[PDB]
Coordinates of N, CA, C and O in Angstrom, one line a residue:
Chain A
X395 N -22.3 -19.8 -5.6 CA -20.9 -20.0 -4.9 C -21.2 -19.4 -3.7 O -22.1 -18.4 -3.2
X396 N -20.1 -19.6 -2.6 CA -19.8 -18.9 -1.3 C -19.8 -17.5 -1.4 O -20.4 -16.7 -0.6
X397 N -19.1 -17.0 -2.3 CA -18.5 -15.8 -2.5 C -20.1 -14.9 -2.7 O -20.3 -13.7 -2.6
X398 N -21.2 -15.4 -3.6 CA -22.3 -14.8 -3.8 C -23.1 -14.8 -2.8 O -24.1 -14.0 -2.9
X399 N -22.9 -15.4 -1.5 CA -23.8 -15.6 -0.4 C -23.3 -14.1 0.1 O -22.3 -13.7 0.2
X400 N -24.4 -14.0 1.1 CA -24.1 -12.6 2.0 C -23.4 -13.4 3.4 O -23.5 -14.5 3.4
Chain B
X401 N 6.8 -22.8 10.4 CA 5.8 -23.5 9.3 C 5.6 -24.9 9.8 O 4.6 -25.3 10.0
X402 N 6.5 -25.5 10.0 CA 6.4 -27.2 10.0 C 5.8 -27.3 11.3 O 5.1 -28.4 11.5
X403 N 6.5 -26.6 12.4 CA 6.0 -26.9 13.7 C 4.2 -26.9 13.6 O 3.6 -27.5 14.4
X404 N 3.7 -25.6 13.4 CA 2.4 -25.1 13.5 C 1.7 -25.9 12.6 O 0.5 -26.3 12.7
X405 N 2.4 -26.6 11.3 CA 1.7 -27.6 10.5 C 1.6 -29.0 11.3 O 0.3 -29.4 11.2
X406 N 2.4 -29.2 12.0 CA 2.5 -30.6 13.0 C 1.2 -30.0 14.1 O 0.6 -31.1 14.4
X407 N 1.1 -29.1 14.5 CA 0.2 -28.8 15.4 C -1.2 -28.6 15.2 O -2.2 -29.1 15.7
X408 N -1.3 -28.3 13.6 CA -2.8 -28.3 13.1 C -3.2 -29.4 11.9 O -4.0 -29.0 10.8
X409 N -2.3 -29.9 11.6 CA -2.6 -31.4 10.9 C -4.0 -32.1 11.1 O -4.8 -32.2 10.0
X410 N -4.5 -32.2 12.3 CA -5.7 -32.5 12.4 C -6.8 -31.5 11.9 O -8.0 -31.9 11.3
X411 N -6.6 -30.1 12.2 CA -7.4 -29.4 11.8 C -7.3 -29.1 10.1 O -8.5 -28.9 9.5
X412 N -6.3 -29.4 9.6 CA -6.2 -29.3 8.4 C -7.0 -30.4 7.6 O -7.6 -30.3 6.7
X413 N -6.8 -31.8 8.2 CA -7.4 -32.7 7.3 C -9.1 -32.8 7.9 O -9.9 -33.2 7.2
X414 N -9.2 -32.2 9.1 CA -10.8 -32.0 9.5 C -11.5 -31.0 8.6 O -12.4 -31.5 7.9
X415 N -11.1 -29.7 8.5 CA -11.8 -29.0 7.4 C -11.6 -29.4 5.9 O -12.6 -28.9 5.1
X416 N -10.6 -29.7 5.6 CA -10.4 -30.8 4.4 C -11.5 -31.8 4.4 O -12.3 -31.7 3.2
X417 N -12.1 -32.8 5.3 CA -13.1 -33.5 5.2 C -14.6 -32.8 5.1 O -15.3 -32.9 4.3
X418 N -14.3 -31.4 6.0 CA -15.8 -30.5 5.8 C -16.0 -29.9 4.6 O -17.0 -29.5 4.1
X419 N -14.7 -29.6 4.0 CA -14.8 -29.1 2.6 C -15.3 -29.9 1.5 O -15.9 -29.7 0.8
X420 N -14.7 -31.4 1.7 CA -15.2 -32.2 0.5 C -16.8 -32.7 0.8 O -17.3 -32.9 0.0
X421 N -17.2 -32.6 2.2 CA -18.6 -33.1 2.5 C -19.4 -31.9 2.6 O -20.7 -32.0 2.1
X422 N -18.9 -30.3 2.4 CA -20.0 -29.4 2.3 C -20.2 -29.1 1.0 O -21.3 -29.0 0.3
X423 N -19.1 -28.4 0.3 CA -19.1 -28.1 -1.0 C -18.0 -28.6 -2.1 O -17.9 -28.2 -3.2
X424 N -17.9 -29.9 -1.7 CA -16.9 -30.6 -2.3 C -15.7 -30.3 -2.9 O -15.2 -29.9 -4.2
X425 N -14.5 -30.1 -2.0 CA -13.1 -29.8 -2.3 C -12.9 -28.1 -2.4 O -12.6 -27.9 -3.6
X426 N -13.6 -27.4 -1.6 CA -13.7 -26.2 -1.7 C -13.0 -25.4 -0.6 O -13.8 -24.4 0.1
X427 N -12.0 -25.6 -0.3 CA -11.3 -25.1 1.0 C -10.8 -23.6 0.8 O -11.1 -23.0 1.7
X428 N -10.8 -23.4 -0.4 CA -10.4 -21.8 -0.6 C -11.6 -20.7 -0.2 O -11.4 -20.1 0.6
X429 N -12.7 -20.8 -0.5 CA -13.9 -19.9 -0.4 C -14.2 -20.3 0.9 O -14.6 -19.1 1.8
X430 N -14.0 -21.6 1.4 CA -14.8 -21.6 3.0 C -13.7 -21.1 3.8 O -14.3 -20.4 4.8
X431 N -12.3 -21.3 3.8 CA -11.4 -20.7 4.7 C -11.5 -19.3 4.5 O -11.3 -18.5 5.6
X432 N -11.5 -18.9 3.3 CA -11.6 -17.1 3.2 C -12.6 -16.7 4.0 O -12.4 -15.9 4.7
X433 N -13.9 -17.4 3.8 CA -15.2 -16.5 4.6 C -15.1 -16.8 6.0 O -15.5 -16.1 6.6
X434 N -14.4 -17.8 6.1 CA -14.1 -18.1 8.0 C -13.2 -17.1 8.1 O -13.3 -16.1 9.3
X435 N -12.1 -16.6 7.5 CA -11.3 -15.4 7.9 C -12.1 -14.2 8.0 O -12.0 -13.4 8.9
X436 N -13.0 -14.0 6.9 CA -13.6 -12.8 6.7 C -14.8 -12.5 8.2 O -14.8 -11.5 8.5
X437 N -15.2 -13.8 8.5 CA -16.5 -13.8 9.3 C -15.9 -13.4 10.9 O -16.1 -12.7 11.8
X438 N -14.3 -14.2 10.8 CA -13.8 -13.8 12.2 C -13.4 -12.6 12.3 O -13.5 -11.8 13.5
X439 N -12.5 -11.9 11.2 CA -12.1 -10.3 11.4 C -13.2 -9.4 11.5 O -12.7 -8.2 11.7
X440 N -14.4 -9.8 10.7 CA -15.4 -8.9 11.1 C -15.9 -8.7 12.5 O -16.4 -7.7 12.9
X441 N -16.2 -10.4 13.0 CA -16.4 -10.3 14.4 C -15.5 -9.5 15.5 O -15.9 -9.3 16.6
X442 N -14.1 -9.5 14.8 CA -13.1 -8.7 15.4 C -13.3 -7.5 15.5 O -12.8 -6.6 16.4
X443 N -14.3 -6.5 14.8 CA -14.7 -5.3 14.5 C -13.4 -4.5 14.2 O -13.1 -3.3 14.9
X444 N -12.7 -4.7 13.3 CA -11.6 -3.9 12.9 C -11.7 -4.2 11.2 O -10.5 -4.3 10.3
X445 N -12.6 -3.6 10.7 CA -12.9 -4.0 9.4 C -12.2 -3.3 8.5 O -12.2 -3.9 7.1
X446 N -11.4 -2.5 8.7 CA -10.1 -2.0 7.8 C -9.2 -3.1 7.1 O -9.1 -2.8 5.9
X447 N -8.9 -3.9 8.1 CA -7.9 -5.3 7.6 C -9.1 -5.9 6.6 O -8.4 -6.4 5.6
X448 N -10.1 -6.3 7.0 CA -10.9 -7.1 6.5 C -11.1 -6.6 5.0 O -11.4 -7.5 4.1
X449 N -11.7 -5.5 4.7 CA -11.8 -5.1 3.3 C -10.8 -4.7 2.7 O -10.8 -4.7 1.4
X450 N -9.7 -4.6 3.4 CA -8.4 -4.5 2.5 C -8.0 -5.9 1.9 O -7.7 -5.8 0.9
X451 N -8.1 -7.0 2.8 CA -7.8 -8.3 2.1 C -9.1 -8.7 1.3 O -8.8 -9.5 0.1
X452 N -10.4 -8.1 1.3 CA -11.4 -8.5 0.4 C -11.0 -7.7 -1.0 O -11.2 -8.4 -2.1
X453 N -10.4 -6.4 -1.0 CA -9.8 -5.7 -2.2 C -8.8 -6.5 -2.8 O -8.7 -6.7 -4.2
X454 N -7.8 -7.0 -2.0 CA -6.5 -7.6 -2.6 C -6.9 -9.0 -2.9 O -6.0 -9.6 -3.8
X455 N -7.9 -9.7 -2.3 CA -8.0 -11.0 -3.0 C -9.1 -11.2 -4.2 O -9.3 -12.2 -4.7
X456 N -10.0 -10.1 -4.2 CA -10.8 -9.9 -5.3 C -9.9 -9.6 -6.5 O -10.3 -10.2 -7.5
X457 N -8.8 -9.0 -6.5 CA -8.2 -8.5 -7.6 C -8.6 -6.7 -7.8 O -8.4 -6.6 -9.1
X458 N -8.9 -5.9 -6.9 CA -9.1 -4.6 -7.1 C -7.7 -4.1 -7.1 O -6.8 -4.0 -6.3
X459 N -7.5 -3.3 -8.1 CA -6.3 -2.6 -8.5 C -5.7 -1.5 -7.7 O -6.7 -0.8 -7.0
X460 N -4.5 -1.5 -7.1 CA -4.1 -0.6 -6.3 C -3.9 1.0 -7.0 O -4.8 1.8 -6.3
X461 N -3.3 1.0 -8.1 CA -3.1 2.3 -8.9 C -4.5 2.5 -9.3 O -5.7 1.7 -9.5
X462 N -4.6 4.0 -9.8 CA -5.9 4.3 -10.4 C -5.6 5.3 -11.7 O -4.5 5.4 -12.0
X463 N -6.8 5.7 -12.1 CA -6.8 6.5 -13.6 C -6.2 7.8 -13.4 O -6.1 8.3 -12.1
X464 N -5.3 8.2 -14.2 CA -4.8 9.7 -14.7 C -6.1 10.7 -14.3 O -6.0 11.7 -13.5
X465 N -7.0 10.3 -15.0 CA -8.3 11.5 -14.7 C -8.8 11.7 -13.4 O -9.3 12.8 -13.2
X466 N -8.7 10.6 -12.7 CA -9.1 11.1 -11.3 C -8.4 11.8 -10.4 O -8.9 12.8 -9.7
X467 N -7.0 11.6 -10.7 CA -6.0 12.5 -10.0 C -6.2 13.9 -10.8 O -6.0 14.8 -9.9
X468 N -6.7 14.0 -11.9 CA -7.0 15.5 -12.4 C -7.9 16.0 -11.8 O -8.3 17.1 -11.5
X469 N -9.2 15.1 -11.5 CA -10.5 15.5 -11.1 C -10.2 15.9 -9.8 O -10.8 17.2 -9.0
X470 N -9.5 15.3 -8.6 CA -9.1 15.6 -7.4 C -8.3 16.7 -7.3 O -8.5 17.5 -6.3
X471 N -7.3 17.0 -8.2 CA -6.3 18.0 -7.9 C -7.2 19.4 -8.5 O -7.0 20.5 -8.0
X472 N -8.2 19.5 -9.5 CA -8.8 20.8 -9.9 C -9.8 21.0 -8.6 O -10.0 22.1 -8.6
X473 N -10.5 20.1 -7.9 CA -11.4 20.2 -7.2 C -10.8 20.6 -5.9 O -11.3 21.2 -5.0
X474 N -9.7 20.2 -5.5 CA -9.1 21.0 -4.3 C -8.2 22.3 -4.6 O -7.7 22.9 -3.5
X475 N -8.2 22.7 -5.9 CA -7.4 23.6 -6.1 C -5.9 23.5 -5.5 O -5.6 24.4 -5.0
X476 N -5.0 22.6 -6.1 CA -3.7 22.5 -6.0 C -2.8 22.7 -7.0 O -3.1 22.4 -7.9
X477 N -1.7 23.4 -6.7 CA -0.7 23.5 -7.9 C 0.2 22.2 -8.0 O 0.2 21.3 -7.1
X478 N 0.8 22.4 -9.3 CA 1.5 21.1 -9.4 C 2.8 20.9 -8.8 O 3.1 19.7 -8.8
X479 N 3.3 21.8 -8.2 CA 4.6 21.8 -7.3 C 4.2 20.8 -5.8 O 4.8 20.0 -5.7
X480 N 2.8 21.3 -5.4 CA 2.4 20.4 -4.2 C 2.1 19.2 -4.7 O 2.4 18.1 -3.6

């Protein structure tokens, strides 16, 4: 998900 | 509130479309990361990681043992 992205 | 809603209804429906077409109805994380990227490019990151801790769910209060640790390590009396 987007939270997992830096 | 309704005045700025009327001012930004195009914006709401626009990033609504972009949320449905990018990650499929994922307005929360996209709008959140937009706020984070903007306010970190603002270079005022205390507010940024404060919002990160409060929206992740990081607890405000803390353990008693850590209070005991800092009290012992600073050599402070119970009165102070």
